[PDB]
Amino acid sequence: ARAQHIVPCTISQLLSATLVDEVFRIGNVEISQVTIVGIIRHAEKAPTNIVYKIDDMTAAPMDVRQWVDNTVVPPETYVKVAGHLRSFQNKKSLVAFKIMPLEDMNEFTTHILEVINAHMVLSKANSQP
Amino acid sequence: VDMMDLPRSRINAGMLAQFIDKPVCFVGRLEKIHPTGKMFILSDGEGKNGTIELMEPLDEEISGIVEVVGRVTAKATILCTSYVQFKEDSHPFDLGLYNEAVKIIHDFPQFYPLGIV
Numbered sequence: 001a002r003a004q005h006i007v008p009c010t011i012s013q014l015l016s017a018t019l020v021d022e023v024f025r026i027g028n029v030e031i032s033q034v035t036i037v038g039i040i041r042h043a044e045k046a047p048t049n050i051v052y053k054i055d056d057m058t059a060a061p062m063d064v065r066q067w068v069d070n071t072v073v074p075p076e077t078y079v080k081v082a083g084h085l086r087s088f089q090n091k092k093s094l095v096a097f098k099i100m101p102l103e104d105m106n107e108f109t110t111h112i113l114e115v116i117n118a119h120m121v122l123s124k125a126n127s128q129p
Numbered sequence: 130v131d132m133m134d135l136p137r138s139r140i141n142a143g144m145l146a147q148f149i150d151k152p153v154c155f156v157g158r159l160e161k162i163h164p165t166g167k168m169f170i171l172s173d174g175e176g177k178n179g180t181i182e183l184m185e186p187l188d189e190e191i192s193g194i195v196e197v198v199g200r201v202t203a204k205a206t207i208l209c210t211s212y213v214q215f216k217e218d219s220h221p222f223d224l225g226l227y228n229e230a231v232k233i234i235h236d237f238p239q240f241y242p243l244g245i246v
Binding site: 058061078 | 133134135136137138139154194198213215216217219220222223226227230233234237239240241242243244245246
């Protein structure tokens with residue numbers, strides 16, 4: 001035991017994930033660490049953290065929380081986020097360990113492809129039942 | 130509304146007729162801006178045009194690859210509620226490849242869900 005992937009996801013997948021045996025699952029794919037790509041719609045600056053509303057078109061924007069001790073990433077910027085999926089008080093959010101503005105927008109197209117291929121192949125590996 | 134809180138389908142121009150009155154996200158290259166500034170044309174990764182309408186005139190020039198969020202109108206144009214120009218100052222955006230992504234999204238909805246499922 002046991003391999004742990006950073007699974008590329010859409011927000012619609014994160015919002016739909018349900019806790020099964022204490023771990024989040026979308027379809028039969030387990031997710032804990034994930035990546036998303038979307039556009040910053042809002043940035044909420046506090047002294048200990050920044051909370052971004054990040055939008056990938058697939059659902060309403062998701063809350064993404066980043067720990068402070070780089071400045072706030074400006075709104076209307078595409079970013080790749082890597083983070084841990086949380087649901088505190090039945091409200092889904094990401095806790096980001098990486099937030100990187102995109103300089104090459106082909107990375108955004110590649111993420112779409114990666115989401116679909118990762119979920120296709122991980123679901124097949126897990127099924128089985 | 131403020132489709133920023135709704136699921137928006139990523140489409141190309143050949144899909145416009147099938148998405149009438151639906152929230153959409155259209156990526157394409159800026160072909161031209163109407164004299165009024167309240168309409169522009171984007172060509173998709175198959176080289177097909179979509180007409181983008183605005184309620185207010187543009188407050189800036191746009192060019193290159195532009196991504197529009199809006200609702201498909203009765204006339205299969207898009208009433209745009211927001212847009213982002215894609216930065217290409219170091220790397221040209223492959224719109225043909227994006228178009229393939231769009232076809233894949235629509236062929237595999239189980240792996241790229243629209244909205245909560």
